[PDB]
Design a protein around this nucleic acid. Structure first.
Ligand SMILES: [Mg+2]
Ligand SMILES: [Mg+2]
Ligand SMILES: [Mg+2]
Ligand SMILES: [Mg+2]
Ligand SMILES: [Mg+2]
Ligand SMILES: [Mg+2]
Ligand SMILES: [Mg+2]
Ligand SMILES: [Mg+2]
Ligand SMILES: [Mg+2]
Ligand SMILES: [Mg+2]
Ligand SMILES: [Mg+2]
Ligand SMILES: [Mg+2]
Lengths: 63, 107, 131, 394
RNA sequence: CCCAUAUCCGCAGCAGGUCUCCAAGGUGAACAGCCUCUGGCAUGUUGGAACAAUGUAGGUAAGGGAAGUCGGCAAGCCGG
RNA sequence: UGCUUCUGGGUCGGGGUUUCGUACGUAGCAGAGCAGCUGCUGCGAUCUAUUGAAAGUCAGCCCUCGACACAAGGGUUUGU
């Protein structure tokens, strides 16, 4: 089975982990855990959350 | 070597885990006194009032997690007392608890 | 041939779900569920792919004050799939049908669960997307 | 008068009394019926519940919705280090049932087994089998053992082996081994004894008892839960919030007549820690334990044909509340009774397995080894380091 | 001298009753509630160890939202 | 269930795992502005770096064999 990526944090979700979310507009999202899901549903921008892949990429933390 | 002194770190966090708020600090003292008897084998355990003040320094429920103490086994000058020896538990202020071992103190 | 699997039921009797077709109905009020034998004190419940008996509470005057057969297509209660995926939707939706399972409308708004799309070919062909 | 609306009763009266089990190690109440035409083999084993995880496999079920498709299935990991045979016990069929006829013990018994014979090992002098063991060393004693073995051939109909676990290889606090009789099914009685005699003091790995894709029964003692009320013990309806004197009760514990409380009425008391037998738990994998080959520790017993990463069955941080599994293990589908560290009896099926689910062949595509101590998200520490990158610890 | 969760009346050092005077800082509309100084007290006629059931008093709960019940009783939502 | 096989469990330490989410201090020509002095110096919520940082983590998580002490004990009974 292929491995998805959390639509909020960018971590990869192995089979049997997290949840899948389907919005009424047709977009579908995956979440690693309820922490990532909670941030996404409260409309938090992942680029301001220090522990997300989008944040570290934006601030060149790994690089 | 009846008269000995050692320095210990007492992990109060795991000793008082699950205890009710109004009993948390009192049970830290009871666990410190239980700890001293185990390490020195002296039913006569005396806890310094400064160590009492350190265990209560944050209130009845938010007790400090770790605490560095010093145990000194001394001779009981009270010939009437049934216990020849007794342990004195004093307080050691420390900035950090990392890498602190059980240390023999030589007077 | 291949039969559907048990999924969590999110819509007991009394649940008011959206109407995701173009009949005119705005929401569907679930009064019963097909196939429920049940037991004492237990409400009949429905999940994606289940046919139910519903009334229209908000909608065209002609669709109200009568019982229609509806089919659930989305649910807000997450259900496990055999690949281990827990899926849920932003809202609970359904479409009016007849006893044969054919849609009373011609278009659906929003996605449709794969559980329901497989079970109802006539609903599936009208689905814009399948989740 | 009749009750207004029908409803099934709560609970099964076939599991009464709902009491704490008298035995901690699950007893085999019925061994498989012996078939004299099959080769000599053992019928049960002891393992310890390490923990649970889930796996990815492709289902092979013609006509099913999951045919040719991958599914995620929970599995229980049972550590099964090889047992040691230490004795034989023979039985005679009598009009009052099987009667223990004769018991013979091996010359050498490890101190793990001997710990089973004492309530205080610390205070004992370890005198068990100190005078019996001399029967194996002198001519008079030896001539008495083969007569005892000959008598068991003439008269006994059922043969069992006293095998015990090896607690020194487990990560547990306990050092006292678990000792159990295992029936020897297979050929004639004489062939059972020659087979059993040759294996005294020898080790029997789990693979020699159970095979891949085999349906077995797990026997154990469920997790104890202490005193429980009828609502939790029997799952009766909670009474309305207005109830005076409590609502977690059964409102009517009987009719006026018979003027007694009946045994079929839900009452409070002990819940959990009940002896239970569960059947048809498929073996998904008999994993090999760690081996040191050519100075290298080989531990990739969680690798699959479709996943070559060198990882063991252990998850990051280890099996929570259990430890590390370094011996052989049996991967069972679904859940079994007991806590972590609980000793589980593995027994061969009493039934004929002719069903597509029972005959299905298991092929694992993936074994989840993420941490269970939280919401683990890395299968290996190598994978975690490659993702996170260097840290301030480094 | 007490003037009242112990000096008075309720059989008692009884969660009841029993007429008044003075009245700090902060927040705040405020003699509201919450914290503090002056002054006062030692938890209300006992302590220790546990943390089963059933309670009494507080909380939280996915999806649904009165389908419960005689009745939305109870709780909840609203709140400046 | 454990209570000397140079072995045992314990305590502390360390490591792993995991939770939250980036510590104090220090630096900044980052900061809406304001004040004083002739570009500089002050006040300033917040921002960036140090810093996936800090903190906690078995009390019923996993592994240590680093430090420290303790461990060869005590009481009551039981005989064909
Ligand atoms: Mg009812
Ligand atoms: Mg009837
Ligand atoms: Mg009442
Ligand atoms: Mg877990
Ligand atoms: Mg009180
Ligand atoms: Mg008191
Ligand atoms: Mg009083
Ligand atoms: Mg709710
Ligand atoms: Mg909700
Ligand atoms: Mg009604
Ligand atoms: Mg009714
Ligand atoms: Mg009301």
């Amino acid at each position: 089975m292929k491995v998805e990526l959390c639509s909020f944090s960018g971590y990869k979700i192995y089979p049997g982990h997290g949840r899948r979310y389907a919005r009424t507009d047709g977009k579908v999202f995956q979440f690693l855990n309820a922490k990532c899901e909670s941030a996404f549903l409260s409309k938090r921008n992942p680029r301001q959350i220090n522990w997300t892949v989008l944040y570290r990429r934006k601030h060149k933390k790994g690089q | 070597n009846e008269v000995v002194t050692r320095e210990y770190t007492i992990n109060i966090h795991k000793r008082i885990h699950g205890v009710g708020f109004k009993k948390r600090a009192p049970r830290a003292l009871k666990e410190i006194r239980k700890f001293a008897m185990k390490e020195m084998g002296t039913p006569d355990v005396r806890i310094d009032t400064r160590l009492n003040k350190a265990v209560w320094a944050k209130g009845i429920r938010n007790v400090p997690y770790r605490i560095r103490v010093r145990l000194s086994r001394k001779r009981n000058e009270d010939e009437d007392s049934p216990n020849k020896l007794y342990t004195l538990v004093t307080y050691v202020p420390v900035t950090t608890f990392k890498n602190l071992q059980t240390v023999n103190v030589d007077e | 041939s291949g039969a559907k699997f048990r999924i969590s039921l999110g819509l007991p009797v009394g649940a008011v779900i959206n109407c995701a077709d173009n009949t005119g109905a705005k929401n569907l009020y679930i009064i019963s569920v097909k196939g429920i034998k049940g037991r004492l004190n237990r409400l009949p419940a429905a999940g994606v792919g289940d046919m139910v008996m519903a009334t229209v509470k908000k909608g065209k005057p002609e669709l109200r004050k009568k019982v229609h057969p509806a089919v659930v297509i989305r649910q807000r209660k997450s259900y496990r799939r055999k690949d281990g995926v827990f899926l849920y939707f932003e809202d609970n939706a359904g479409v009016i049908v007849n006893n044969k399972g054919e849609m009373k409308g011609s278009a659906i708004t929003g996605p449709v669960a794969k559980e329901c799309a497989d079970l109802w070919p006539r609903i599936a062909s009208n689905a814009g997307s399948i989740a | 008068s009749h009750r207004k609306f029908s409803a099934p009763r709560h609970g099964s009266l076939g599991f009464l009394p709902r009491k704490r089990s008298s035995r901690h190690r699950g007893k085999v109440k019925s061994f498989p019926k012996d078939d004299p035409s099959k080769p000599v083999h053992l019928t049960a084993f002891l393992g310890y519940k390490a923990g649970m995880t889930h796996i990815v496999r492709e289902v092979d079920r013609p006509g099913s919705k999951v045919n040719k498709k991958e599914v995620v299935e929970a599995v229980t990991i049972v550590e099964t280090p090889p047992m040691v045979v230490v004795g034989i016990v023979g039985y005679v069929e009598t009009p009052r049932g099987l009667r223990t006829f004769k018991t013979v013990f091996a010359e050498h018994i490890s101190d793990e087994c001997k710990r089973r014979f004492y309530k205080n090992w610390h205070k004992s002098k370890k005198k068990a089998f100190t005078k019996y063991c001399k029967k194996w060393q002198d001519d008079a004693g030896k001539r008495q053992l083969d007569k005892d073995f000959s008598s068991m051939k003439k008269y006994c109909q059922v043969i069992r082996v006293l095998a015990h676990t090896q607690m020194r290889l487990l990560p547990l606090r306990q050092k006292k081994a678990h000792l159990m009789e295992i029936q020897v099914n297979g050929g004639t009685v004489a062939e059972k004894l020659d087979w059993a005699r040759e294996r005294l003091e020898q080790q029997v790995p789990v693979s020699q008892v159970f095979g891949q894709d085999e349906m077995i029964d797990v026997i154990g003692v469920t997790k104890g839960k202490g005193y429980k009320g009828v609502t939790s013990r029997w799952h009766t309806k909670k009474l309305p919030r207005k109830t005076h004197r409590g609502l977690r009760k059964v409102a009517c514990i009987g009719a006026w007549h018979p003027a007694r409380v009946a045994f079929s009425v839900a009452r409070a008391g002990q819940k959990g820690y009940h002896h239970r037998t569960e059947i048809n738990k498929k073996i998904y994998k008999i994993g090999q334990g760690y081996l040191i080959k050519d100075g290298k520790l080989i531990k990739n017993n969680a690798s699959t044909d479709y996943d070559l990463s060198d990882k063991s069955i252990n998850p990051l941080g280890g099996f929570v509340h259990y430890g590390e599994v370094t011996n052989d293990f049996v991967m069972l589908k679904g859940c079994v009774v007991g806590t972590k560290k609980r000793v589980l009896t593995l027994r061969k099926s009493l039934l004929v397995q002719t069903k597509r689910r029972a005959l299905e062949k298991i092929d694992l595509k993936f074994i989840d080894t993420t941490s269970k101590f939280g919401h683990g998200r890395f299968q290996t520490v190598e994978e975690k380091k490659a993702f996170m990158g260097p840290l301030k610890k480094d």
